[PDB]
């Protein structure tokens, strides 16, 4: 996909899922060096060990996870032009909603940051940087 | 300043300077958790040790530093609402130009990223997020 995708086959309303964000490096020269994803204020959020990357999960006053950021360690050149990388976070409970989005911000080695924060295609509109979105089973 | 500022009293064309970026947290609730600054493709770029933060300096094929990123370690809550933080990088040689800018991207704990990439005030225009800029002595 030329887009960041979100995958979580289980995914149910009020459920816990391992969510995988697959991110493309859309530059011919610069590499992806960090990814920040906005989380739907979940009670639980745990990343899995990713050699060469450090993850932080930020929390609000209620101890909900509000976002997660993965950052390439020094010496790690990050995700190269043309390649994809998976970033995995286990979260829950997912909202009691039909749909949930995960606005994301992708940092490149050349200093640029790409926002993946547009709402879904409708009418027409065909956004080139939509927020990754999941449908949640009842 | 309600803006990111750049300070480097020495700063000369073809010179080496310690450049200090002072960054305000402009949220009432979210904290600054990373800063990425675009560098003018310098041969040399070294950060100074910042407890609780990790820095990476990205390079291109010619071994020039193209950007620098500081990221708050896990457990470090980042720069709190209303506070400022200095991020310091020693770089050179600075371009043979009267002016150099350092476009920056500021990440907040709530997942938002603020771009400091607008060109300087002129006519009209009075940008609220200008790229930090230095004047370089001849």
């Amino acid at each position: 996909s030329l887009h960041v995708t979100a995958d979580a086959p289980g995914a149910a309303q009020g459920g816990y899922s391992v969510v995988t964000f697959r991110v493309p490096t859309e530059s011919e020269t610069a590499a992806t060096t960090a990814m920040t994803v906005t989380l739907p204020n979940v009670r639980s959020a745990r990343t899995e060990p990713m050699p060469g990357w450090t993850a932080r999960v930020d929390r609000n006053d209620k101890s909900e996870a509000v976002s997660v950021t993965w950052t390439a360690d020094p010496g790690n050149p990050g995700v190269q032009p043309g390649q994809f990388q998976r970033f995995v976070v286990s979260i829950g409970p997912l909202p009691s909603a039909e749909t949930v989005s995960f606005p994301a911000e992708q940092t490149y080695s050349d200093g640029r940051v790409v926002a993946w924060n547009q709402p879904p295609a409708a009418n027409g509109s065909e956004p080139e940087h939509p927020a990754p979105t999941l449908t949640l089973a009842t």
Side-chain angles (χ1 to χ4, degrees), chain A residues 45-103:
Chain A
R46 291 155 45 103
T47 55
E48 57 187 46
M50 189 169 175
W53 297 76
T54 294
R56 62 182 284 120
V57 169
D58 280 272
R59 305 256 176 186
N60 65 12
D61 47 5
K62 305 177 178 71
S63 299
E64 295 161 336
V66 297
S67 76
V68 49
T69 299
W70 292 267
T71 303
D73 300 340
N76 180 355
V79 185
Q80 298 303 301
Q83 300 285 320
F84 293 74
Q85 168 73 49
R86 295 174 314 109
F87 293 92
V88 176
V89 62
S90 171
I91 61 178
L94 295 171
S96 292
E98 294 72 32
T99 317
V100 57
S101 294
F102 304 90

Side-chain angles (χ1 to χ4, degrees), chain A residues 1-7 19-24 84 87 116 132-133:
Chain A
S1 172
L2 305 209
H3 293 164
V4 170
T5 61
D7 203 74
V19 180
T20 290
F21 296 98
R22 187 172 192 250
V23 178
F84 293 74
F87 293 92
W116 297 90
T133 299

